[PDB]
Structure 1
Amino acid sequence: PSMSITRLFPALLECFGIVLCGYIAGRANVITSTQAKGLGNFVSRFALPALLFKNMVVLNFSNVDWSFLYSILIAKASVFFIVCVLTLLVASPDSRFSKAGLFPIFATQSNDFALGYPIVEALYQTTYPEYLQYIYLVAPISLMMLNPIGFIFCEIQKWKDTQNASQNKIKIVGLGLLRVLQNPIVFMVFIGIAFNFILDRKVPVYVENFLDGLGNSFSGSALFYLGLTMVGKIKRLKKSAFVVLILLITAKLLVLPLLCREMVELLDKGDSVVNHTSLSNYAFLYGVFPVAPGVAIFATQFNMEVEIITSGMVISTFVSAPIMYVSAWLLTFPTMDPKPLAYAIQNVSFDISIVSLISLIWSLAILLLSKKYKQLPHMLTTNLLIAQSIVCAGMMIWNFVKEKNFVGQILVFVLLYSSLYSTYLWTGLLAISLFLLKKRERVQIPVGIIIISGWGIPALLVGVLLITGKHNGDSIDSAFFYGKEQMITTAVTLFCSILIAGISLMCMNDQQLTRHVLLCLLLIIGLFANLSSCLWWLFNQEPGRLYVELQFFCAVFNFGQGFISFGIFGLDKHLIILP
Structure 2
Amino acid sequence: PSMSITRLFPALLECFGIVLCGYIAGRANVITSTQAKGLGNFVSRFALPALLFKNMVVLNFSNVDWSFLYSILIAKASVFFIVCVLTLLVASPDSRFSKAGLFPIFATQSNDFALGYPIVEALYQTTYPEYLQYIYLVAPISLMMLNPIGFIFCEIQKWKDTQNASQNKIKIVGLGLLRVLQNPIVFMVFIGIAFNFILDRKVPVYVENFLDGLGNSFSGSALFYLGLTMVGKIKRLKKSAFVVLILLITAKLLVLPLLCREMVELLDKGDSVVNHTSLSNYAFLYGVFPVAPGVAIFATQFNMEVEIITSGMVISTFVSAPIMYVSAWLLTFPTMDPKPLAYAIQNVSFDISIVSLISLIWSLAILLLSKKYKQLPHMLTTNLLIAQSIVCAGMMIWNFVKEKNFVGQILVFVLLYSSLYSTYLWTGLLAISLFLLKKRERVQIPVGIIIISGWGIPALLVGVLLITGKHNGDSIDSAFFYGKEQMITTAVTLFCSILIAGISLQQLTRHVLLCLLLIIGLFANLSSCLWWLFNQEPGRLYVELQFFCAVFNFGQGFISFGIFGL
TM superposition score normalised by structure 2:
0.92
Query: Residue in 2 aligned with 1:405?
Result: 405
What displacement does 1:493 show? 3.1
User: Quick check: 271-280 or 430-439, which moved more?
Assistant: 430-439
**CA deviation string 1:64-105 (max 9, x = no partner):** 211012111122122222222222222232242222222222
What displacement does 1:491 show? 2.8
Q: Is the 8 A contact 1:40 1:222 kept in 2?
A: yes
**CA deviation string 1:125-169 (max 9, x = no partner):** 101111001111111112222112222332222333334454533
Query: Cα distance 1:219–1:569, how it changes in 2: closer, same or farther (>3 A)?
Result: farther
Query: Cα distance 1:199–1:512, how it changes in 2: closer, same or farther (>3 A)?
Result: farther
Query: Cα distance 1:429–1:89, how it changes in 2: closer, same or farther (>3 A)?
Result: farther
User: Quick check: 284-293 or 381-390, which moved more?
Assistant: 381-390
Q: Is the 8 A contact 1:436 1:442 kept in 2?
A: no
Query: Cα distance 1:443–1:244, how it changes in 2: closer, same or farther (>3 A)?
Result: farther
Q: Distance in 2 between matches of 1:236 and 1:337?
A: 48
Q: Is the 8 A contact 1:406 1:473 kept in 2?
A: no
Q: Distance in 2 between matches of 1:243 and 1:551?
A: 31
User: Quick check: 349-358 or 115-124, which moved more?
Assistant: 349-358
Query: Cα distance 1:536–1:212, how it changes in 2: closer, same or farther (>3 A)?
Result: same
Query: Cα distance 1:45–1:438, how it changes in 2: closer, same or farther (>3 A)?
Result: farther
Q: Distance in 2 between matches of 1:489 and 1:239?
A: 43
The DSSP-based 3-state class of the residue aligned with 2:446 is coil
Q: Distance in 1 between matches of 2:306 and 2:383?
A: 37
The DSSP-based 3-state class of the residue aligned with 2:227 is helix
What displacement does 1:299 show? 2.0
What displacement does 1:376 show? 5.5
Q: Distance in 2 between matches of 1:371 and 1:34?
A: 40
**CA deviation string 1:306-337 (max 9, x = no partner):** 22222221111111111111211121112211
The DSSP-based 3-state class of the residue aligned with 1:466 is helix
Q: Is the 8 A contact 2:472 2:483 kept in 1?
A: no
The DSSP-based 3-state class of the residue aligned with 2:452 is coil
Q: Is the 8 A contact 1:26 1:228 kept in 2?
A: yes
Query: Cα distance 1:167–1:492, how it changes in 2: closer, same or farther (>3 A)?
Result: farther
Q: Is the 8 A contact 1:533 1:550 kept in 2?
A: yes
The DSSP-based 3-state class of the residue aligned with 1:146 is helix
Instruction: Quote the sequence identity (%).
Output: 100
User: Quick check: 465-474 or 21-30, which moved more?
Assistant: 465-474
Q: Distance in 2 between matches of 1:368 and 1:423?
A: 20
Q: Is the 8 A contact 2:380 2:451 kept in 1?
A: no
Query: Cα distance 1:170–1:542, how it changes in 2: closer, same or farther (>3 A)?
Result: farther
User: Quick check: 130-139 or 298-307, which moved more?
Assistant: 298-307
Query: Cα distance 1:568–1:46, how it changes in 2: closer, same or farther (>3 A)?
Result: farther
User: Quick check: 42-51 or 206-215, which moved more?
Assistant: 42-51
The DSSP-based 3-state class of the residue aligned with 1:322 is helix
Q: Distance in 2 between matches of 1:517 and 1:122?
A: 41
What displacement does 1:455 show? 3.6
**CA deviation string 1:473-501 (max 9, x = no partner):** 43211122233332233234334554555
Query: Residue in 1 aligned with 2:331?
Result: 331
User: Quick check: 360-369 or 418-427, which moved more?
Assistant: 418-427
The DSSP-based 3-state class of the residue aligned with 2:356 is helix
Q: Distance in 1 between matches of 2:436 and 2:140?
A: 53
What displacement does 1:540 show? 0.7
Q: Is the 8 A contact 1:465 1:482 kept in 2?
A: no
Query: Cα distance 1:413–1:277, how it changes in 2: closer, same or farther (>3 A)?
Result: same
Q: Distance in 2 between matches of 1:241 and 1:305?
A: 11
Q: Is the 8 A contact 1:409 1:472 kept in 2?
A: no
Q: Is the 8 A contact 1:39 1:225 kept in 2?
A: yes
Query: Cα distance 1:488–1:233, how it changes in 2: closer, same or farther (>3 A)?
Result: farther
What displacement does 1:33 show? 5.0
Q: Is the 8 A contact 1:23 1:230 kept in 2?
A: yes
User: Quick check: 4-13 or 556-565, which moved more?
Assistant: 556-565
What displacement does 1:551 show? 0.6
Query: Cα distance 1:280–1:447, how it changes in 2: closer, same or farther (>3 A)?
Result: same
Q: Distance in 1 between matches of 2:276 and 2:162?
A: 52
Query: Cα distance 1:200–1:529, how it changes in 2: closer, same or farther (>3 A)?
Result: farther
What displacement does 1:519 show? 4.6
The DSSP-based 3-state class of the residue aligned with 1:448 is helix
User: Quick check: 350-359 or 541-550, which moved more?
Assistant: 541-550
What displacement does 1:429 show? 4.4
TM superposition score normalised by structure 1:
0.90
**CA deviation string 1:411-469 (max 9, x = no partner):** 21222222223333444544666667766786894826862454444434434533425
The DSSP-based 3-state class of the residue aligned with 2:466 is coil
User: Quick check: 307-316 or 417-426, which moved more?
Assistant: 417-426
Query: Cα distance 1:112–1:28, how it changes in 2: closer, same or farther (>3 A)?
Result: same
Query: Cα distance 1:405–1:76, how it changes in 2: closer, same or farther (>3 A)?
Result: same
User: Quick check: 515-524 or 551-560, which moved more?
Assistant: 515-524
Query: Cα distance 1:493–1:26, how it changes in 2: closer, same or farther (>3 A)?
Result: farther
What displacement does 1:276 show? 0.8
Query: Cα distance 1:197–1:369, how it changes in 2: closer, same or farther (>3 A)?
Result: same
Mark the structure with the bigger radius of gyration.
Answer: 2
The DSSP-based 3-state class of the residue aligned with 2:467 is coil
Q: Distance in 1 between matches of 2:450 and 2:33?
A: 43
Q: Distance in 2 between matches of 1:85 and 1:192?
A: 35
Query: Residue in 2 aligned with 1:119?
Result: 119
Q: Distance in 2 between matches of 1:60 and 1:106?
A: 31
Query: Cα distance 1:359–1:302, how it changes in 2: closer, same or farther (>3 A)?
Result: same
CA RMSD of aligned residues (A): 2.7
Q: Distance in 2 between matches of 1:103 and 1:201?
A: 40
Q: Is the 8 A contact 1:436 1:444 kept in 2?
A: no
Q: Distance in 1 between matches of 2:293 and 2:163?
A: 30
Query: Residue in 2 aligned with 1:308?
Result: 308
**CA deviation string 1:512-536 (max 9, x = no partner):** 6666555555434433322221222
Q: Distance in 1 between matches of 2:169 and 2:430?
A: 57
What displacement does 1:281 show? 0.4
User: Quick check: 189-198 or 440-449, which moved more?
Assistant: 440-449
Query: Residue in 2 aligned with 1:574?
Result: none
Q: Report how many aligned residue pairs link the two structures.
A: 565
Query: Residue in 2 aligned with 1:273?
Result: 273
User: Quick check: 135-144 or 417-426, which moved more?
Assistant: 417-426
Q: Distance in 2 between matches of 1:477 and 1:407?
A: 17
User: Quick check: 512-521 or 299-308, which moved more?
Assistant: 512-521
Q: Is the 8 A contact 1:406 1:472 kept in 2?
A: no
What displacement does 1:350 show? 1.4
Query: Cα distance 1:436–1:119, how it changes in 2: closer, same or farther (>3 A)?
Result: farther
Query: Cα distance 1:183–1:11, how it changes in 2: closer, same or farther (>3 A)?
Result: same
Q: Distance in 1 between matches of 2:319 and 2:29?
A: 25
Q: Is the 8 A contact 2:469 2:486 kept in 1?
A: no
Query: Cα distance 1:301–1:504, how it changes in 2: closer, same or farther (>3 A)?
Result: farther
Query: Residue in 2 aligned with 1:488?
Result: 488
Q: Distance in 2 between matches of 1:427 and 1:142?
A: 49
The DSSP-based 3-state class of the residue aligned with 2:232 is coil
Query: Cα distance 1:160–1:401, how it changes in 2: closer, same or farther (>3 A)?
Result: same
Query: Cα distance 1:362–1:107, how it changes in 2: closer, same or farther (>3 A)?
Result: same
The DSSP-based 3-state class of the residue aligned with 1:482 is coil
Q: Distance in 2 between matches of 1:488 and 1:71?
A: 49
**CA deviation string 1:542-567 (max 9, x = no partner):** 63322022211211222222234334
User: Quick check: 512-521 or 538-547, which moved more?
Assistant: 512-521
**CA deviation string 1:33-68 (max 9, x = no partner):** 565322222111211111112111111222221101
User: Quick check: 267-276 or 293-302, which moved more?
Assistant: 293-302
User: Quick check: 548-557 or 3-12, which moved more?
Assistant: 548-557
